[PDB]
Design a protein around this ligand. Sequence first.
Ligand code: HEM
Ligand code: HEM
Lengths: 145, 145
Amino acid sequence: SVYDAAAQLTADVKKDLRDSWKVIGSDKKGNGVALMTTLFADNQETIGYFKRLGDVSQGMANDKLRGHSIVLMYALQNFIDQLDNPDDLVCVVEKFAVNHITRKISAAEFGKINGPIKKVLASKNFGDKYANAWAKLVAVVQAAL
Amino acid sequence: SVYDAAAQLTADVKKDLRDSWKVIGSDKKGNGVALMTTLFADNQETIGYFKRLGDVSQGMANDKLRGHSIVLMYALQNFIDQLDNPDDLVCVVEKFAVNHITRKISAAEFGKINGPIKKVLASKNFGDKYANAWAKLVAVVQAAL
Ligand code: HEM
Ligand code: HEM
C-alpha cells in the first residue's frame, strides 16, 4: 500500500533526504526549473503533457513554467516535512497522486523524474546514495499511481 | 490587475504577514484544517465545490480534507516566500488562480476565505491589523480570478 512504502523509509534514508534537501530546496526557483528542463531535454515525449505551460524551451523566462516549477518544489518540501509521520505523508502523497491520475500519468511515467533528480543532485555533488534515497521517496508516490 | 494588487504589499504589510505566518505556519495541519472547517461552518453554501473530499464534517479525521489542508498551507507558505520578488509572487498566484478558475470559483467566492483567516488569527491573538494584512495578500489572488 502507499503506507507500506512510506513506512519503509528508514532513519538513514530520511537523513539523506533531509541533508540533500537543505541544499537543493534552498533555491526552489532555480532548481525547480532545472528539474523541469532536464525532464523535457532527456524525455522529449513528455513535453506534450505540459501544453498549458506554453513554450517550455523558454525556461526561466516562461512565467507559467517558473510558477509550476516553484509549486512542484513546495510539493517536495511538504514531503520532506512529513517524513516522520507516515499518516500525514500518505494523505499528501495521495492528494498529489490524484493530480497526476487525472492527467493519466502512470507509475512508470512518474518514475521518469528520477533521471532529472539524479542530475540536479549530482550538480550539487550529491551522488548515487542520495539519488537512491530520492528514488525511494518517488516510489511512495508510484505506490499511489 | 495582479501587478497593481501586488504593488499594494508595502513594507509594513509584508512585515505583518511574515510575523503572523511565523505563528500560524508552525502548525500547518492544525491551522489548515481549522481554516477549512471554519469556511464550511460559516459558509455552508461553498461545501458543494469540495465534493471530492467526501464528508468534510469529519474534519481532521477525513484524510482527504487533511491532505488538502496541509497543501493549502504550503500554498500560503509559498506566497510568503515570494514577497521579496513581485514577478515570482505573480507567477505562483496565477498558477493557483488557474486551479480555482477551472473549479468555477469567482473572485467574490474566493474572498469568503477572509472570514476564516481573521477567526484563526484571532484565536492566536493576532487582531484586525493582521487580518487586514492577509486580506491584501488574498486580494492579489482575487485580482487574477
Ligand atoms: C518529483 C515528482 C513530481 C512532483 C512532486 C509533481 C508535482 C506536480 C504538481 C504539484 C503539479 C500541479 C498540480 C495541479 O495544480 O494540477 C503537477 C502537475 C503536473 N505534473 Fe507533476 N509532479 C512530478 C512529476 C511529474 C512527472 C514525471 C510527470 C510526467 C511524466 C508529471 C506530469 C504532470 C502534469 C501533466 C501536470 C499538469 C501540468 C499542468 O497542466 O499544469 N509530473 N505536478
Ligand atoms: C487562502 C485561499 C486559498 C488558497 C491558497 C487555496 C489553495 C488551494 C490549493 C493549493 C488547492 C489544490 C489545487 C489542486 O490540486 O487542484 C485548492 C483547491 C480547491 N480550492 Fe482553494 N484555496 C483557497 C481558497 C479557496 C476558497 C475560498 C474556495 C472556494 C469558496 C476554494 C475552492 C477550491 C476548490 C473547489 C478546490 C478543489 C478541491 C478538490 O476537489 O480537490 N479555495 N485550493
